[PDB]
Design a protein around this nucleic acid. Structure first.
Ligand SMILES: [Mg+2]
Ligand SMILES: [Mg+2]
Ligand SMILES: [Mg+2]
Ligand SMILES: [Mg+2]
Ligand SMILES: [Zn+2]
Ligand SMILES: [Zn+2]
Ligand SMILES: [Zn+2]
Lengths: 47, 166, 56, 54, 108, 65, 97, 127, 61, 133, 55, 83, 50, 115
RNA sequence: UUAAUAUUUGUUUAAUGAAAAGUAUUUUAUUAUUAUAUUGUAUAGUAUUAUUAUAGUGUAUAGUUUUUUAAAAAUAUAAAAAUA
């Protein structure tokens, strides 16, 4: 994949909102464990 | 402004929200008994009690006395399906067996049942729980549900058991 | 590192077992025909924002 | 044959037994319901009620 | 082939509702059209008044096959499946009955 | 709004105000039950939507009878 | 006592034997010649037998994987038919009276 | 007013003892709050589904889970009391099961009538 | 999102600001920052009576 | 925004639980550090009784006259007993709508921690640091 | 303003080198002299022989 | 070798070993308190080729104790009755 | 209308949208807090007769 | 490579294995039977001995996993990962404990053999 | 067709009881104490396993345990000299 990464094969851009929604969801999972609720996946259908 | 009502034959259409049938198709854990009584219930009850309408009705005294056939038969020929759960007394000496009782019986009625029909005279207490009937599906996928029952844990004085020969 | 290559490896193992059961020589086997065509498909809901939805 | 007691009766018997134990020890037995009258407590303007909780 | 399928699938792709279900599965509802057709084609004696009347075929009668395979062959009625409208004739329509292999008995 | 078919098996964009559908997680397509649903058929016992009636008469006939 | 529980369980199931299928049931033509006392006596007999059979059926349903189908299932049907015949006779006599 | 006693609406105990739908025997003299009139169906369904919330902070008749079936409740047999647990007002309601004895030819009668071994696991028994 | 939190070597004050746990001898200011229905901090017990009264009376006389 | 320091420094005058320690409503000994069932109200004073803050049990932090909770979690010391402001001012006994025989108060000076003595205590203590001597 | 692409516009990606190097290419391998398994030079096995003398 | 045991600590402190062990688990597992449960740990019926799954069999320690629940959380009427 | 159009100030994170599933009984048992709710006469007699 | 993200894997270790007090004669070609069991040992170094403090620490950490609460945690983790959509996770009814009496007995026998 | 696409990616847990709501096959769910009939206890809602601690009591150190990836542009936040 070295030649591909050199010639920019693929989307040069990337997702930007994830590095914050990840920690938001981790805090929410902490809150769910506090409230004694089962932990669910963040993205069940948006995947 | 009026409609052209001279073009339709006199037949009543179906309402737009079509009503669901009164039959309850849900066989889950929150199944609800319908409090509304219908005419067919009374009709079947009369026909089962005194052969309506082929037989004249008995007088009010006989109908409201203990000698009316339903009550007479329920007293002299009782129909109570008390069955023992073998998983409690099979190859284990336990002090509290478990019975499956018709949901209409009570603790004192079960004590009398065990004391008179079988002779179990050592009963300390009874703990009753009402459970929904066991539901399942057959090969074709049709939903079946057994009759509702009551789990009765009966504490005794002397531990009892049933030995299974290996 | 490909899922399709893994699937073809499983198929190759099964076909080699079948050929050895038939009686052919393992060291002289050769892929004479490999081809794929579409098969059954399943649907999955894709709920989107603003009350939209699609089916994957 | 035991009389069917309630919690109020049990607390009143607790007061009685406390007074009796104080009398047996010899110190001044302070029976609470001796200062109780028709209008309420004789001297204390307080409010008391049975049965007492924990 | 379930374990092979789940092995060939990738660990990243997840599948949900493995032990429960969003919709209540205890509401009775009809089958698919082809499944109802399979039922109707297999169990035809469930229809009312399917049994032939009057019944004339009893075990011990000598009968000839008038159509189908084994035409013109005679035989004796061995058994009578009356509700299915079927006859078991002697040495007629003999087929192999495969009996699966149990723990201590081989496949016969 | 509704840039495709109306059935849930269609492949384009829909909307709730015009084509409201009940939540169907995963169901077989127009051709046949795929492996993604047969996995549920063999593990959970029914398709993961719960709207399908389990009809295993053929495998019953093949094994038990 | 344990003797009162041993009648809830089938003896052949305890001894790991094949429970044979009984002969028949109490028919109406035979129950017409019985008094009310004998009728309720055999009714309680049928009641105890039905309790035992229902316990057996429940046990096999609880263990359907380990234990196969319950042997000799016609006993439940025979008991039900006998009880229905007894009820028929009692109803006839009650209507006459 | 109502036909049923008022403890079924608000039990005499401070905790709310004696709340729910009480079924009575047809020949009994006591009267309960299980009525199937078009006017009583709402409150009966409410007791069956929603339950009843007491001012003490507890649900008396149906907290949650499986709903009760008032059509199969054992018949009412009395009224509550503060002294004891329960006063049996109607004794004829309780089924005192009583069977006859061996008097007569009862020793020859069997559950079945006589018409004129190692068990093995099977999938199906016909008869 | 905070630079002090992203910094690889956290300061003691930065680690104190993460003491949101309702506990004995915790960050009282960081626990008071959250609402009253979230943090279990009752009203301040201020001792009144003759003990402060006589003191302030002497100091004022 | 809160405008009060956190983790009050007791280097000038340490506030520690004494080995011997009785109550104000009860005059009975309390647990020292094993259980926080007591209520510590420190103010940095050796004024009798129970210097460097008195102590109360959770159950007994209530008024001693009417045997009720406190209004704003503020009690009134009355000849060695703790009364409430309606009791001290001479008003009638008012039954609270909330909890009756216990008040909203934290354990182990947690509720009285945000106010009191902090660092520095006096002015002559800062000049001790900023001077070389 | 995009429109449907014909099969010839789809196959133009195959003519490029970025498509062939990603999909249509083989591996240079040999048999591991210790494990007798196919192996590419530069990567080794979890084995006390293949970690000391990594072939 | 003398490692910490919950039963030994409860016997030392006289703290009802069952209640002591329940002190270190979610309240919904031992009491009738609102708590969510995973659908996988709930029992499922038997299938052809496998025995039945029971929640009480697969999690015996995660069972609610009605005795402890009533003696700790539910209120008794014997202290309330005033005749 | 505040927040959302259909839901209004009722936030999705706070509370339940519709807290009436089927039927709900507005009545509360023993809302009067009477000392004896068993009825006018129940158990022990109250006061001297006549 | 790691199947999830196709990342290249690397085995990092220390060089002087024989000159060490711990890990003297340990074989890393294959992991142990359990993660709490002592690692594999070559047949030549079977009589080796470990430092007593590290031995006691490892014994405590391993005895941590010999309880029934760990079996409950194991089944609950099965349930959690099955609810979270992770495939190839069996049902907590089909799972079996990592530590049993006979397995512990034979592992103790092997540990006494390795001394 | 877009589409070799956007999106997902599970390596580290600071908090404690109801009712509405939800009925998911609790096989005997619990095993007992007291007394005394009867009745019912595990899972919200926003079309979802979703920015989500439903604030009714009550208080607290149980760490009350699912977030990949080896450089770049533009963008998004945070910091950003002894120049002004
Ligand atoms: Mg409800
Ligand atoms: Mg649901
Ligand atoms: Mg919801
Ligand atoms: Mg929405
Ligand atoms: Zn005190
Ligand atoms: Zn006061
Ligand atoms: Zn190698």
């Amino acid at each position: 994949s070295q030649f591909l990464k050199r010639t920019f094969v693929g989307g040069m851009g990337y997702n930007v909102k994830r590095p914050y929604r990840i920690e938001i969801r981790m805090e929410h999972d902490k809150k769910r464990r506090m409230r004694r609720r089962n932990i669910g996946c963040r993205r069940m259908m948006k995947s | 402004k009026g409609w052209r009502t001279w073009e339709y034959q006199h037949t009543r259409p179906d309402p737009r929200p079509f009503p669901d049938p009164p039959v309850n198709d849900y066989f889950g854990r929150s199944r609800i008994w319908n409090p509304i009584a219908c005419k067919l219930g009374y009709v079947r009850k009369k026909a089962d009690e005194w052969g309506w309408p082929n037989k004249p009705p008995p007088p009010t005294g006989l109908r409201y006395s203990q000698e009316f056939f339903p009550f007479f038969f329920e007293r002299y020929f009782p129909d109570a399906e008390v069955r023992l759960l073998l998983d409690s007394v099979l190859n284990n000496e336990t002090k509290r067996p478990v019975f499956q009782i018709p949901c209409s019986m009570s603790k004192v009625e079960l004590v009398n049942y065990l004391k008179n029909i079988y002779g179990i005279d050592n009963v300390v207490r009874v703990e009753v729980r009402n459970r929904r009937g066991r539901r399942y599906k057959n090969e074709v996928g049709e939903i079946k549900m057994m009759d509702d029952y009551k789990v009765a844990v009966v504490e005794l004085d002397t531990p009892v058991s049933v030995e299974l020969k290996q | 590192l490909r899922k399709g290559h893994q699937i073809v490896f499983r198929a190759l193992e099964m076909a080699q077992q079948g050929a050895e059961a038939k009686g052919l020589d393992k060291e002289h086997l050769r892929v004479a025909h490999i081809s794929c065509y579409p098969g059954p498909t399943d649907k999955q809901i894709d709920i989107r924002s603003k009350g939209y939805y699609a089916w994957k | 044959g035991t009389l069917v007691f309630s919690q109020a009766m049990r607390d009143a018997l607790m007061d009685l037994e406390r007074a009796v134990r104080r009398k047996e020890l010899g110190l001044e037995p302070n029976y609470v319901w001796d200062r109780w009258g028709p209008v309420g407590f004789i001297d204390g303007a307080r409010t008391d009620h049975l049965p007492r909780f924990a | 082939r379930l374990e092979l399928l789940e092995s060939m699938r990738h660990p990243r792709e997840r599948d949900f509702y493995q032990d429960h279900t969003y919709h209540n599965q205890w509401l009775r509802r009809d089958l698919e059209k082809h499944q109802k057709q399979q039922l109707a084609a297999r169990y035809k004696y469930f229809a009312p008044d399917f049994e032939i009347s009057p019944w004339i075929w009893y075990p011990g009668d000598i009968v000839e096959v008038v159509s189908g395979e084994g035409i013109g062959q005679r035989g004796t009625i061995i058994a009578v499946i009356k509700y299915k409208n079927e006859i078991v004739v002697q040495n007629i329509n003999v087929q192999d009955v495969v009996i699966p292999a149990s723990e201590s008995r081989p496949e016969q | 709004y509704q840039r495709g078919g109306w059935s849930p098996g269609s492949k384009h964009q829909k909307h709730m105000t015009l084509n409201p559908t009940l939540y169907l997680y995963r169901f077989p397509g127009p051709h046949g039950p795929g492996p993604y649903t047969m996995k549920y058929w063999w593990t959970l016992g029914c398709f993961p939507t719960g709207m399908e009636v389990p009809f295993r008469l053929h495998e019953f006939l093949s094994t038990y009878q | 006592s344990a003797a009162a529980f041993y009648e809830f369980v089938d003896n052949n199931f305890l001894n790991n034997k094949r429970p044979p299928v009984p002969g028949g049931s109490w028919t109406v033509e035979v129950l017409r010649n019985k008094s009310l006392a004998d009728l309720q006596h055999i009714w309680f007999l049928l009641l105890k037998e039905r309790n035992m059979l229902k316990s057996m059926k429940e046990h096999y349903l609880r263990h359907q994987e380990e234990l196969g189908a319950m042997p000799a299932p016609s006993r439940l049907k025979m008991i039900d038919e006998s009880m229905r015949n007894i009820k028929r006779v009692v109803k006839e006599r009650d209507e006459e009276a | 007013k109502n036909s049923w006693p008022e403890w079924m609406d608000n039990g005499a105990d401070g905790t709310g003892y004696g709340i729910g739908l009480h079924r009575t025997h047809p020949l009994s003299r006591l009267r309960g709050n299980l009525k199937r009139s078009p006017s009583h169906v709402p409150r009966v369904l409410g007791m069956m589904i929603q339950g009843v919330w007491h001012k003490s902070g507890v649900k008396l008749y149906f907290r949650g889970g499986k709903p009760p079936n008032p059509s199969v409740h054992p018949y009412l047999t009395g009224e509550p009391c503060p002294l004891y647990g329960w006063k049996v007002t109607d004794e004829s309601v309780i089924r005192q099961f009583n069977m006859p004895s061996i008097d007569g030819t009862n020793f020859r009668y069997k559950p079945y009538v006589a018409l004129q071994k190692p068990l093995a696991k099977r999938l199906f028994f016909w008869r | 999102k905070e630079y002090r939190l992203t910094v690889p070597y956290r300061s003691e004050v930065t680690m104190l600001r993460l003491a949101n746990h309702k506990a004995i001898n915790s960050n009282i200011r960081e626990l008071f920052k959250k609402p009253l229905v979230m943090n279990n901090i009752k009203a301040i017990p201020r001792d009144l009576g003759e003990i402060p009264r006589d003191y302030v009376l002497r100091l004022l006389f | 925004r809160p405008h009060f320091p956190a983790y009050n420094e007791d280097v000038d005058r340490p506030m520690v639980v004494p080995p011997d320690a009785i109550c104000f409503n009860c005059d009975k000994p309390i647990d020292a550090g094993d259980v926080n069932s007591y209520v510590w109200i420190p103010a940095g004073n050796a004024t009798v009784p129970t210097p460097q803050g008195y102590f109360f049990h959770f159950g007994c932090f209530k008024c001693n006259r009417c045997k009720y909770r406190l209004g704003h979690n503020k009690f009134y010391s009355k000849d060695g007993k703790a009364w409430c402001i309606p009791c001290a001012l001479g008003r009638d006994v008012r039954v609270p709508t909330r909890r009756w025989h216990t008040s909203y108060v934290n354990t182990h000076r947690t509720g009285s921690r945000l106010t009191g003595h902090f660092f520095p205590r006096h002015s002559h203590q800062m000049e001790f640091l900023f001077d070389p001597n | 303003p995009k429109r449907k692409k014909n099969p010839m516009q789809l196959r133009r990606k195959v003519y490029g080198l970025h498509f062939k190097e990603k999909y249509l290419k083989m591996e240079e391998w040999y048999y591991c002299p210790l494990c007798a398994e196919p192996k590419k030079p530069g990567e080794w096995c979890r084995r006390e022989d293949c970690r000391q003398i990594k072939p | 070798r003398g490692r910490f045991n919950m039963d030994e600590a409860a016997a030392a402190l006289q703290l009802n070993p069952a209640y002591a062990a329940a002190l270190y688990r979610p309240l919904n597992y031992t009491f009738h308190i609102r708590g969510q449960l995973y659908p996988a740990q709930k029992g499922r019926p038997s299938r052809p080729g496998s025995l039945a799954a029971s929640q009480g069999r697969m999690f015996p320690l995660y069972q609610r104790n009605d005795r402890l629940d009533k003696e700790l959380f539910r209120l008794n009427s014997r202290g309330l009755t005033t005749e | 209308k505040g927040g959302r159009a259909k839901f209004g100030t009722r936030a999705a994170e706070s509370g339940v949208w519709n807290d009436v599933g089927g039927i709900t009984s507005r009545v509360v048992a023993n809302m009067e807090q009477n000392p004896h709710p068993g009825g006018d006469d129940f158990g022990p007699p109250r006061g001297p007769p006549k | 490579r790691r199947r999830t993200d196709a990342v290249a894997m690397y085995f990092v270790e220390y060089k002087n294995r024989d000159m060490s007090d711990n890990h003297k004669g340990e074989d890393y070609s294959a992991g142990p039977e359990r993660f709490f069991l002592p690692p594999r040992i070559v047949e030549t170094e079977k009589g080796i001995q470990r430092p007593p403090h590290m031995q006691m620490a490892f014994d405590r950490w391993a005895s941590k996993f010999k309880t029934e609460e760990f079996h409950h945690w194991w089944r609950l983790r099965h349930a959690k990962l099955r609810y979270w959509g992770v495939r190839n996770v069996p049902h907590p009814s089909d799972v079996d404990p990592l530590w049993t009496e006979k397995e512990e007995e034979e592992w103790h026998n092997e540990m006494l053999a390795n001394t």
